Amino acid sequence: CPLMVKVLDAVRGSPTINVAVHVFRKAADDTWEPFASGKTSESGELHGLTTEEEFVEGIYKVEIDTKSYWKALGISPFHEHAEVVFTANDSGPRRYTIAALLSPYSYSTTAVVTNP
Amino acid sequence: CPLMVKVLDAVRGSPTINVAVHVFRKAADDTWEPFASGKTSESGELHGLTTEEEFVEGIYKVEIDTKSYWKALGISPFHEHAEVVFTANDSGPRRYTIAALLSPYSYSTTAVVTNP
Amino acid sequence: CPLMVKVLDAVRGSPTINVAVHVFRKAADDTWEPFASGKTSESGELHGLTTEEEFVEGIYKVEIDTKSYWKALGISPFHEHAEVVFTANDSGPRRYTIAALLSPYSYSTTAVVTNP
Amino acid sequence: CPLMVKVLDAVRGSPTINVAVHVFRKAADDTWEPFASGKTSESGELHGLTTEEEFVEGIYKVEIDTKSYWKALGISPFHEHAEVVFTANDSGPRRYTIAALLSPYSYSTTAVVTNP
Ligand SMILES: Cc1ccc(C(=O)c2cc(O)c(O)c([N+](=O)[O-])c2)cc1
Numbered sequence: 216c217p218l219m220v221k222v223l224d225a226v227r228g229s230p231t232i233n234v235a236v237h238v239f240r241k242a243a244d245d246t247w248e249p250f251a252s253g254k255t256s257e258s259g260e261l262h263g264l265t266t267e268e269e270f271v272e273g274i275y276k277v278e279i280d281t282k283s284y285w286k287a288l289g290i291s292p293f294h295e296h297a298e299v300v301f302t303a304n305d306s307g308p309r310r311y312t313i314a315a316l317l318s319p320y321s322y323s324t325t326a327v328v329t330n331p
Numbered sequence: 332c333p334l335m336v337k338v339l340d341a342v343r344g345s346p347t348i349n350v351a352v353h354v355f356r357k358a359a360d361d362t363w364e365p366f367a368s369g370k371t372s373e374s375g376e377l378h379g380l381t382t383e384e385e386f387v388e389g390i391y392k393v394e395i396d397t398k399s400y401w402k403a404l405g406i407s408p409f410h411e412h413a414e415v416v417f418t419a420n421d422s423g424p425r426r427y428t429i430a431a432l433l434s435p436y437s438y439s440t441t442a443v444v445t446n447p
Numbered sequence: 448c449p450l451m452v453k454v455l456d457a458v459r460g461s462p463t464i465n466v467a468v469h470v471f472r473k474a475a476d477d478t479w480e481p482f483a484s485g486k487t488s489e490s491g492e493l494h495g496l497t498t499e500e501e502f503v504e505g506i507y508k509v510e511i512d513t514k515s516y517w518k519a520l521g522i523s524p525f526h527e528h529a530e531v532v533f534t535a536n537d538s539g540p541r542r543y544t545i546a547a548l549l550s551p552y553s554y555s556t557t558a559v560v561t562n563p
Numbered sequence: 564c565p566l567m568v569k570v571l572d573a574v575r576g577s578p579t580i581n582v583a584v585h586v587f588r589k590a591a592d593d594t595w596e597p598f599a600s601g602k603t604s605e606s607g608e609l610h611g612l613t614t615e616e617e618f619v620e621g622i623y624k625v626e627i628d629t630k631s632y633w634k635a636l637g638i639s640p641f642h643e644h645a646e647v648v649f650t651a652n653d654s655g656p657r658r659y660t661i662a663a664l665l666s667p668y669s670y671s672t673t674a675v676v677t678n679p
């Protein structure tokens with residue numbers, strides 16, 4: 216699985232379940248081409264977005280629909296979404312975990328990049 | 332000042348100087364109109380981006396050029412930038428501080444919103 | 448496994464391997480009684496610290512030896528360690544994951560608390 | 564002011580007012596000597612804890628009473644407090660800002676260290 220997304224809720228201390236995630240890859244004309252999408256599981260994780268063969272070098276964007284999550288919980292959010300833009304595989308294929316820790320007025324994102 | 336951006340370096344424990352910041356506002360046709368730009372000062376802060384009169388209701392995007400900051404220190408970071416998108420002034424005028432805490436493979440962002 | 452500790456490195460974008468972790472429980476005389484200890488695995492995780500029978504209600508402290516980690520990497524750290532103090536199981540047994548994201552001059556900690 | 568503490572609420576996007584802060588210094592016998600204390604102001608900041616003359620080399624502990632803050636808002640948070648332990652002024656006098664960003668199940672802390 217070369218790309219995994221994990222989303223956590225800092226208000227409730229829980230994984231964020233059923234949050235929509237969209238992945239894009241930058242096109243030659245600096246536009247965002249859809250690439251993959253899904254919703255997080257009960258563990259807050261989204262697997263199976265891509266394969267090692269499709270996940271070539273390039274710039275990728277991960278958009279997490281955080282606003283819809285907080286609205287479903289009845290909490291007023293600040294951000295429209297959480298976005299993460301990064302260059303992938305520039306030094307050979309890696310396994311990427313994009314982790315996002317969500318609060319209504321703050322979020323953090325980290326990348327855990329390992330070599331299989 | 333209705334909009335301030337502050338940027339900190341979590342590796343060195345210091346404000347980030349001369350980091351480029353670009354602000355955009357979503358137009359009626361759902362395109363990003365350039366709104367303001369600047370670079371952070373010695374204190375890591377960028378003031379004077381806009382005025383209360385110009386800073387009307389809308390969706391705004393703040394893009395911080397974190398990659399150039401790390402590259403100038405010799406580091407190839409994970410993220411291409413740090414981008415924050417939010418609705419502003421939907422309940423009347425507020426003062427917004429957008430703060431970003433930077434590491435090579437992680438960043439966090441918060442919003443401090445006050446009512447003068 | 449009622450208690451797991453996970454530690455991540457925000458500079459290198461990797462799990463923190465071989466970091467020492469010590470767990471204490473507060474004694475009747477407000478002193479810290481040792482409870483469990485270990486070192487993180489290749490995945491940055493420390494499992495098997497306790498059992499559901501031993502992990503009773505109480506106040507617990509998790510101390511992560513972050514200073515030794517950064518010294519081993521040749522990076523100057525700010526903190527002497529990372530500590531997390533929390534009340535456990537006050538509403539029935541839970542599964543706790545204590546996650547720490549480390550930078551030389553900053554750290555974050557979250558708790559993911561689930562019901563089996 | 565050589566030592567400042569700033570505390571922010573990541574749920575509401577606001578500084579935290581009237582949060583208790585206690586500072587300790589490690590003595591020769593390895594005990595924590597009370598050094599200074601105060602409460603955060605309307606801006607979430609606590610100034611005037613010490614002077615450059617009194618703030619000598621040593622190991623210091625800053626304990627922020629985050630639990631009382633959340634309890635006053637009706638929330639039972641995960642952490643009992645936020646505690647930061649660090650060596651100060653080992654390379655000469657510095658100015659330290661300890662900043663804490665609070666959520667019910669997560670907190671982050673950073674240090675901004677400057678040389679006047
Ligand atoms: C920015 C941030 C801070 C803390 C967390 C975080 O709490 C977390 C929790 C996990 O169970 C876990 O498996 C991972 N991970 O794999 O990276 C991260 C996640 C994101």
Ligand SMILES: Cc1ccc(C(=O)c2cc(O)c(O)c([N+](=O)[O-])c2)cc1
Nearest residue numbers: 430431432439440441660662664673
């Ligand atoms: C995501 C994050 C976490 C912590 C900080 C942070 O450390 C910080 C430091 C300041 O001196 C300061 O004035 C503010 N602020 O007002 O927002 C934040 C900044 C950003």
